[PDB]
Amino acid sequence: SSVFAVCGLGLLGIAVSTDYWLYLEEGIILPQNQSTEVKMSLHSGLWRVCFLAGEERGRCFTIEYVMESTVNVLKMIRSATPFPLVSLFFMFIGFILSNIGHITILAFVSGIFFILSGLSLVVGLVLYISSINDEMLNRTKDAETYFNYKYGWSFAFAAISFLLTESAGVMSVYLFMKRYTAE
């Protein structure tokens, strides 16, 4: 129950820091199917969003301005930003109170904070993904252009940490179910 808590903090911490949430492969088409080369292709993150093909320069920008569709997504990710932060808040609170219980309700209430982090992270993934399909649908249907959003490495850092928290969510209560019955 300590190990799932220990592994839970780092995986989302990598995810909330890294710049590989979302891909993009905005290109074109030609007859004889002759598609494209790269035309506009960015990977993206949560705080630092780094272009890769449209200008090759990684303008990993503290998001307030430019450096057309991309920042429009980043205004919607801004609405979806706090829930991985809220999940990181209740994860660390659940981590500290778990070791204090190692040194009663002190360990049991930590398992409350694993779930309240995880339920923050489910809505965090939902509002993030529903933000993309908002901006997917605002992209005008066009035979030339195309759009290839792709969920990058950070979700396996993030959503697997949701499994880690809920594993640590249920370990803490059986920890409370083995310790209270000894009392």
Partner 1 sequence: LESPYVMMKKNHEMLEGNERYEGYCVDLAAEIAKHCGFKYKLTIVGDGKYGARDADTKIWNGMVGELVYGKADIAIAPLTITLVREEVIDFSKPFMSLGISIMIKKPQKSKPGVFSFLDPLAYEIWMCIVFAYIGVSVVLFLVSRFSPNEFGIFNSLWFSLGAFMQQGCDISPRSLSGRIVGGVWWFFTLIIISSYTANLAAFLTVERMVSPIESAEDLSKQTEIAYGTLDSGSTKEFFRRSKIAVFDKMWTYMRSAEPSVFVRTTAEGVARVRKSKGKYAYLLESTMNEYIEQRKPCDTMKVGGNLDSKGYGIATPKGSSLGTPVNLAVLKLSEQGVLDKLKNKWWYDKGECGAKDSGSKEKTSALSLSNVAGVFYILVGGLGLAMLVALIEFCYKSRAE
**Hey, what's the torsion of the CAs at 132, 17, 42, 64, to 10 degrees?**
70
115 binds, among ligand PCW, partner 1, none (CB under 5 to 8 A by kind): partner 1
Is residue 104 near ligand PCW by the rule CB under 6 A? Answer: no
* Size of the residue set binding ligand PCW (CB under 6 A): 8
Find the shortest distance in angstroms from Cβ 98 to ligand PCW.
15
Is residue 174 near ligand PCW by the rule CB under 6 A? Answer: yes
Cα–Cα distance for residue pair 89/156, rounded to 1 Å: 19
Per CB under 6 A, contacts with ligand PCW among 51-70 are none
Let me know: does 42 contact 24? Beta carbons within 8 Å.
yes
Site for ligand PCW (CB under 6 A): which residue of 24, 167, 168, 176?
167
Per CB under 8 A, contacts with partner 1 among 83-122 are 112, 115, 119, 122
Burial class (CB in 10 A: 0-12, 13-18, 19+), 72: middle
Find the shortest distance in angstroms from Cβ 145 to partner 1.
12
Name the β-bridge partners of 151: 22
96 binds, among ligand PCW, partner 1, none (CB under 5 to 8 A by kind): none
Cα–Cα distance for residue pair 113/124, rounded to 1 Å: 16
35 binds, among ligand PCW, partner 1, none (CB under 5 to 8 A by kind): none
C-alpha distances in Å from residue 37, one per residue of 26, 30, 34, 69, 114: 10, 11, 9, 20, 45
Which residues contact partner 1 by CB under 8 A?
112, 115, 119, 122-123, 126, 129-130, 133-134, 136-138, 140-141, 170, 174
